[PDB]
Structure formats: structure tokens, C-alpha cells
Structure 1
Amino acid sequence: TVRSEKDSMGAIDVPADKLWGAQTQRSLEHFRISTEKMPTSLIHALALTKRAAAKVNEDLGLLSEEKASAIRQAADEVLAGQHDDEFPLAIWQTGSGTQSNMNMNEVLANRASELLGGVRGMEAKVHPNDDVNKSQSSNDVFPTAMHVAALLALRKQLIPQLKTLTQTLNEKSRAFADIVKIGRTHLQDATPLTLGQEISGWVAMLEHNLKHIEYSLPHVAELALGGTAVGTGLNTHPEYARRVADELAVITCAPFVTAPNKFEALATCDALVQAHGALKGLAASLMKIANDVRWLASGPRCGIGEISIPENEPMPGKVNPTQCEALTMLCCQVMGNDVAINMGGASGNFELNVFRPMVIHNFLQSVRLLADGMESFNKHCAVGIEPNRERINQLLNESLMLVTALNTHIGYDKAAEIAKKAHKEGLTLKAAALALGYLSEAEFDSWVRPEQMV
């Protein structure tokens, strides 16, 4: 029920029913820190990187077609979800991520050996370093997998959910474009606007956020692979960097390119620091939108109550805005994640930044949170937003903001005293214009038109 695997330090027992090797077993035993492991997206990006590396090595005659094809088949099994329990290492490992690199090397090598009729272990047909890490160093693969995982998650998860939410709110803005409501500035009653105009603010924010996220993608698309140990490219084929970047782009349809400067690519996590800046921008925007929604829906009777939202969980009328709560809670998380990333990104030394598992742990979490959170908020809240037209009108007409519709029909002097009297006395603006008798109730209803004040 165990197997003896070897590395440059000796032999160690690994679980017989597992595909990993000596370096993984050592890391697994030396970093028993908390519960965070590499996320599946990073595992898949690592498998993709080894699949592209294998194909390019084959193309260059540096690795046999049998070994190359067996490696790509094993990597496709990882990508297909067959080997999730084969990657047990903690986030809190060596700062370069090289132990997770070896975890992929060993799992792919053993599984490739099986696929060629060999065994897993010392006598395997495919070797983790010699074959699966061929033309790679210990230092330039993990940074590559970080950018592959990050770019694919922004393109395939976050941007599509962002676009869907924007379209829902754009539709809602159009449907409610002629519902006039009271404005609120400093939380006080203010000049009116339409519910559709207010939502159009939310829509415009999400469109700006999309642009900012898109501006960050070209830097993330630059890959370190080919820099080898310190960025010089020593001990790799001079076409390898460009060729692997080219293969990754083919098999993902994403515009990966090799990093024009490998020293910047290995010494920093700057592309992710910058990209996460755009995500904390989105988190601040989503906080605002979520808060507007839950405040406008507050009630049923002692809040604002201008809109209603769907009731999805198990005393009538009480609807806790639980999607707004999950959303605001994960927006706080993104702000915190940004500080952790900023500290790691600032803390590179010389030729290599060794804060990488932590940086990518936070970055991919922020993407999951923002993508899944907008998907959940959209389907369980935003699509169901409806006005409470009686309440909106009650608030608007019983307010004192509409007095300014009277200044060319009575002068600022008399309207001001209607406003003052109605307020000291607790009256409408109609009732206070009648008691002082500067107006008839037909004169009011024709002069104070909220629909022309927007």
C-alpha cells in the first residue's frame, strides 16, 4: 500500500494508489500549514503548460513521439477532471511554486508511463525531470501557469458574467426609464430622477469596469516560459519561448505571447498586481450597486421600499437581501486580497519573486468570487428587480423637493413660504399652497410636473 520513489535526496514512501512522487511527498509532509491548496484552475493551467511544452519539445526533436504523446494524453486527463486528488500541496510552500511544478511533473510522468505499458515509480518509462520538465527550469514554469490560469479565468469566467449582469441592468434601466422618483444626496431628499436613470449609473459603472479589466489583459498574456533559471534562457532551445507561447495560444484561443523581458517576468508579479487593481475597482463598484439595491428594497414598512427583490429563502413582507449580503461580503474580501497581493508583489528580490503561491491564491480567489458572485446576484436578485410604483409616488409627492416647479408661476418668494409652511406644519405642498391660497388644486396639478424635472 506504499511505493518507494526517489529524488536527489533519497527514497521515500508515497501512497501506492497515488501518482505523485518523491518531491511531492516531501513537500506534503514539510508544509502542514492550514487548509488552502492550489485551486483547480491553477492545476489545469499547469497541465496545459506541460501539454504545450511536450508538443513543442516533440516538434524540436528533443523528445520522442511516444513520450510526448503519452504526456499530452495524461495532461488531457488532468484537464478532464480525472486526477483531482493527485495534487495535495499547500499554498504555503516554497515561494517559487516549484514544488507544485514537480507535483505536475511526477503525476504526468507516472501516468504517461502507465499509458505506455510501464509502471509508476523508479522503473517508470517517463521521467518527471528528464522528460516532463524537459527544456524548462525550476523557476519559469509556475509563473507561466499563474498567467495562463489568470488570463483564462478573466476571459472565460469573469468577463462573461460581468457582461450578463450589465445586460440585465441595462434592460431594467430601459423598462423603468419613465418612473420618476426622489433623488438622494448625503442621504437627504434631493432633486428627482428616473429609476431608469439611476440604474443607468450602475450600467455605466459596469461598462467602465469591463474596459479597465480588458486593459489589463495584454500584460497578463506575457509568459515567463523560456527565461529558465534567471531569465537569460540558458539551457533551453532559442526558439522554445516563442514556440510554447504560440502553442498555448493555439490550444486556448487566448492571445498568449512570450514575455519580451524575462527578467521582469521572473523578478516580479507586476502584471497581476496591476490586473488585481482593476478587480478591486470592480469590487468597489459592485459594493455601491449592491448597497443601493438593498437600501432601495428595505422595508417592508420602515425603510425606503422603492423596489422589490425576489424572496428565495424561508411573518409577511420581510425579505432579507441575502444576495446583496453575499456580494458585499465578497467585495470586502477582494479589497483584503489586494493588500496581500500588493505586499507580495512589492517583495521580490533580485532575479526571482518568491511570493507566488500566495499571490496567485488571492488573485484566482478574487476572480472566482467576482465571477460567481455576479452570476449569483444576477440570477437570484437583479433579474427580479421591480418598482413599487405606489411607494415611489407616495415618497415623491409627499416630499418638499418639488417646490421649485413654482418659481416662474409665483416667484421664489411665495413658493419658499409654501415649502416652509408645509414643513413646519406637516402638510403636502398642495395643502400648504391651499391654506395660504396662492393656488388652486388644478393650478398645482398642472404646474408641478415631476416628469419634466429629469
Structure 2
Amino acid sequence: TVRSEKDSMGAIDVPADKLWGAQTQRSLEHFRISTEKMPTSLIHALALTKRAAAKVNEDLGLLSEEKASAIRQAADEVLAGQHDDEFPLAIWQTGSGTQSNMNMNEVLANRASELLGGVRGMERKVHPNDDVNKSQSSNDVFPTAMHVAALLALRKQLIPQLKTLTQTLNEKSRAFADIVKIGRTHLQDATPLTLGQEISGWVAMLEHNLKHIEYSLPHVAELALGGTAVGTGLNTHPEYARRVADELAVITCAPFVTAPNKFEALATCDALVQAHGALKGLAASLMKIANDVRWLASGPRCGIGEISIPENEPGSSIMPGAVNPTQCEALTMLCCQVMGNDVAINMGGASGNFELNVFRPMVIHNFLQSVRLLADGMESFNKHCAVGIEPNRERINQLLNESLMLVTALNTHIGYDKAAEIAKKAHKEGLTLKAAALALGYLSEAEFDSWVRPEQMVG
């Protein structure tokens, strides 16, 4: 049921059916804080880092081919989802991520030993420190895994979903390009614009956010691996840092490079503080877009009601006709989450000392959460709401034509004085602009229909 595993402090019992070792077991017993664990993206990035390190150590003649191949095979098993229950450690561990580094070293060593015909435990044929951690330090491995996970998540999840949502809204903007509606400034009725123009604002916001996110990628692509314990690379081959970045770039198909200054790479989380700045920008943009959608869809009768959205879940049986904007609610909630995550990241990033920033598990927990929230939130909002946005054309026209705002089209025909008189009379007596104008005898009905053309008021 248990086996005895050892580290420099002594022996400790580990579950027989688990692949980790003594240091993982100590962390599991001493850091029992809350429920947040390393996310799968980060575990995979740690496995990729070890896979690349083993390949380079073999190329340099520092690690035998049979050991290096077995380590890479064990790492591929982690990436293939075969070992999710072998990583039991909390986010709230040592601030360098040493314990999760050792978790990977121990699981990979014990599994690689089995792949070479050996066993797990202290009789193993592959060793967590001398083999799996060769040429490495927790201090440079963990920030490498942080940047690998972050860059891949941005490239493979967030950016595709952002592009997909932008395309949907761009199609809606073109489809609704001719639909004139009332403007709203300060929440008050205002000069008209088209529904397509209003949506084009959302599109332009999402296009700008994509650029800002792309600008953050080169710094995240810089990897600490090869700085070792304090940034000097003491005890490493001079080609190791470049070689391992190159190998990570090959196996991930992403443009990883070695960090030109390893002291900055170890002492800070600056690349992620900056990249998260772009994500909180996206959260502010998505909050505004989601709010416009739910306010424009508010109703069915006592709100704005200019657009309809898909109804995907049963409504309340006592609220007839109501369609709750549930995707908008999930999206606005996660946008608040991203804003809070930014503060946590900023505090951790500001708090490095000397050669090492030791707020790393918390920083990456927040960063990767924000990426999941924004990527999955954009996917959900796109599929279940944005693709189905439709205008309520009769309601749009009713609001526009019963407003006071079309009165400006009369200025050039009867003068601003009488046009203002028409608007004040309509407002005071609760009439339409046309009715007030006819009551005053300032024009005929034919003149009003010829002069007041909303389609000529949106240029």
C-alpha cells in the first residue's frame, strides 16, 4: 500500500500506486492550503521542459541515450494525459516552484525506470536529480514552464477565439449596415447611427486588443532555462541555454528563444505582468461589448429591446417573455475576475528580491486562469449569443421615429428656430415631431416625409 522514498532529509512513505517521490510527498503533507493545484497546461509545460532538457543533455554527451529516451517517453505519457493524478501539489507551495519541479523530476524518473525494465522507488534506474534535473535548477525550470504554458495558451486558445468572435461581429456589422437606430450618450437619446456602425465599434475594439496581445508575445517567448540558480549559468555547457530554447521551439512549433538577460529572467515576472496588462485591456473591452448586448436586448417590453439574442435555457415560469442574457452575465463576471487577477499578479511581480522572484506559482495560477476565462468566454459568447444577434427592426424604427432626435433634419428647410420650437412643443405636449410640426403649421406632411430621412443622417 506504501513504499519508502528518500531524499536528503530521510525517508517518507509514499503511496505504492503513485509515481512521485519523497519531496512531492513532503509538499503534499506540508502545503495543504485550499484546493487550487497546478493546471494541466503548466504540468504539460513542465513535461515539455524536461523532454527538451533530456534531448539537449544527450546531444551534449552528458546523459546516456537510453536514459534520455526513457525520460522523453515518460514525458510524452504526461502530455498524452496518462498521469494527471501524479501531480497532487498545491499552488500555495514554495514561491520558486521547487516542489512542482521535483514532482516532475520524481514522476519522470520513477516512470522512466519502469520503461527501462526497472522499478519505481529507491531501486530505480533513472534518478530525479542527477538525471531528470541534470543541467537545471528549479529557479530556471519553473519560469521556463511558466512562459511555455503562457505563450502556448495565448497562441492556441486565446488568439483563435478572439479572431473567431471578431469575424462573427464583423459579419453582423456588415449585415446591419443600413439599419438606422437612435444614438445614446450619457444614457440619453442622441444623434442616430446605424446598428452596423455601433457593432463596428465592437469589432475595432477586438482588432485593437489582438494587436496589443501580439505585442506582448516576444517577451513571453524569452526563456530562463540555462540561467541555473542565480542567472550566471555556472556549471552549464555554454551552448545549453540556446540549445534547449531551440529544442523547445522545435517540439512546440512556437518561437521560443533564450532570454538575453538571465538575471531579469530569474528576478522578475515582468513579461507576464506586461502580457496580463493586455488581457485586462481585453476584459475591459469585452465588459463593454457584453453590456451593450444585454442592454440592447433588455425587455421584452420595459427596456430598450433593439436586438434579440438566442434563448438557450428555459426562462422563469413567472416572468413571461423574459430572455435572460446569460452568456453576457458569465462574460461580465469573468471580466471582473481578470481585473482582480491583474492585481494579484502585479503584487507578486513587484515583490522579487535580489536574484529570484518567489511569487511564481501564484502569478502563473492567475495568468493561466485569465487566459482560460477569456478564451473559453469568447468561445461561449460567440457560439451561444453573438452568432445569433438579430435586430428588432420594428422596435428600432418605433424608438427612432418617436424620438425628438430627427428634428435636426428640419434646420436647413425651415430654420433652426422653428425646428427647435417643434422639438420643444413635441416634448412638452407628448407629440411626435411630425404632429407638433403640423399643429404649428410649419410644414405639410409631404414635406416632413421628404425632408426627414434618417438614412441621410449617419454620414
Q: Which of the five TM-score ranges fits, normalised by the shorter chain?
A: over 0.9
Alpha-carbon offset, residue 427 of structure 1 = 0.3
The residue that corresponds to 2:109 in the other structure is 109
Greater shift after overlay, 217-226 or 313-322? 313-322
3-state secondary structure, aligned to 1:278? helix
| Structure 1 unaligned regions, length at least 5 | none
3-state secondary structure, aligned to 2:322? coil
3-state secondary structure, aligned to 1:191? strand
3-state secondary structure, aligned to 1:183? strand
Alpha-carbon deviations, 1:101-131, whole Å to 9, x = none? 0000000000101111100010001000010
Greater shift after overlay, 291-300 or 433-442? 433-442
Alpha-carbon offset, residue 235 of structure 1 = 1.1
User: How far apart in 1 are the matches of 2:321 and 2:184?
Assistant: 24
Alpha-carbon deviations, 1:131-173, whole Å to 9, x = none? 0000102311000000000000000000000000000000000
Alpha-carbon offset, residue 303 of structure 1 = 0.1
3-state secondary structure, aligned to 1:407? helix
3-state secondary structure, aligned to 2:5? strand
User: How far apart in 1 are the matches of 2:176 and 2:137?
Assistant: 58
The residue that corresponds to 2:64 in the other structure is 64
3-state secondary structure, aligned to 2:134? coil
User: How far apart in 1 are the matches of 2:82 and 2:456?
Assistant: 63
After TM superposition, list the pairs within 5 Å mapping 1:11-410 onto structure 2.
Answer: 11-314=11-314, 315-410=319-414
User: How far apart in 1 are the matches of 2:138 and 2:351?
Assistant: 20
Q: Percent identity?
A: 100
Give the TM-score normalised by structure 2. 0.99
Alpha-carbon deviations, 1:208-248, whole Å to 9, x = none? 00000000000000000000000000011111100000000
Give the TM-score normalised by structure 1. 1.00
Alpha-carbon deviations, 1:344-401, whole Å to 9, x = none? 0000000000000000000000000000000000000000000000000000000001
3-state secondary structure, aligned to 2:120? coil
User: How far apart in 1 are the matches of 2:177 and 2:320?
Assistant: 30
1:435 aligns with 2:439: yes
User: How far apart in 1 are the matches of 2:245 and 2:7?
Assistant: 30
Alpha-carbon offset, residue 75 of structure 1 = 0.3
The residue that corresponds to 1:7 in the other structure is 7
Runs ≥4 residues deviating over 6 A:
none
User: How far apart in 2 are the matches of 1:408 and 1:181?
Assistant: 22
User: How far apart in 2 are the matches of 1:257 and 1:21?
Assistant: 32
Alpha-carbon offset, residue 317 of structure 1 = 1.8
Alpha-carbon deviations, 1:299-336, whole Å to 9, x = none? 00000000000000115421000000000000000000
3-state secondary structure, aligned to 1:329? helix
* RMSD (CA atoms): 0.5
Alpha-carbon offset, residue 441 of structure 1 = 1.0
User: How far apart in 2 are the matches of 1:59 and 1:3?
Assistant: 35
User: How far apart in 1 are the matches of 2:265 and 2:5?
Assistant: 33
3-state secondary structure, aligned to 1:102? helix
User: How far apart in 2 are the matches of 1:51 and 1:29?
Assistant: 28
User: How far apart in 2 are the matches of 1:387 and 1:366?
Assistant: 32
User: How far apart in 2 are the matches of 1:112 and 1:453?
Assistant: 72
User: How far apart in 2 are the matches of 1:273 and 1:259?
Assistant: 16
3-state secondary structure, aligned to 2:424? helix
User: How far apart in 2 are the matches of 1:202 and 1:99?
Assistant: 44
User: How far apart in 2 are the matches of 1:237 and 1:122?
Assistant: 29
| Structure 2 unaligned regions, length at least 5 | none
User: How far apart in 1 are the matches of 2:320 and 2:247?
Assistant: 59
Alpha-carbon deviations, 1:62-120, whole Å to 9, x = none? 11110000000000000000000000000000000010000000000001011111000
Alpha-carbon deviations, 1:176-217, whole Å to 9, x = none? 000000000000000000000000000000000000000000
User: How far apart in 2 are the matches of 1:161 and 1:268?
Assistant: 29
User: How far apart in 1 are the matches of 2:62 and 2:173?
Assistant: 59
User: How far apart in 2 are the matches of 1:217 and 1:415?
Assistant: 55
User: How far apart in 1 are the matches of 2:335 and 2:137?
Assistant: 37
User: How far apart in 2 are the matches of 1:372 and 1:80?
Assistant: 22
Alpha-carbon offset, residue 18 of structure 1 = 0.3
Alpha-carbon deviations, 1:400-440, whole Å to 9, x = none? 01100001100001111110100100000010011111111
User: How far apart in 2 are the matches of 1:381 and 1:413?
Assistant: 46
3-state secondary structure, aligned to 1:197? helix
User: How far apart in 2 are the matches of 1:131 and 1:226?
Assistant: 16
User: How far apart in 2 are the matches of 1:183 and 1:231?
Assistant: 57
3-state secondary structure, aligned to 1:140? helix
User: How far apart in 2 are the matches of 1:137 and 1:360?
Assistant: 18
Alpha-carbon offset, residue 274 of structure 1 = 0.2
User: How far apart in 1 are the matches of 2:334 and 2:138?
Assistant: 34
3-state secondary structure, aligned to 2:139? coil
User: How far apart in 1 are the matches of 2:320 and 2:55?
Assistant: 63
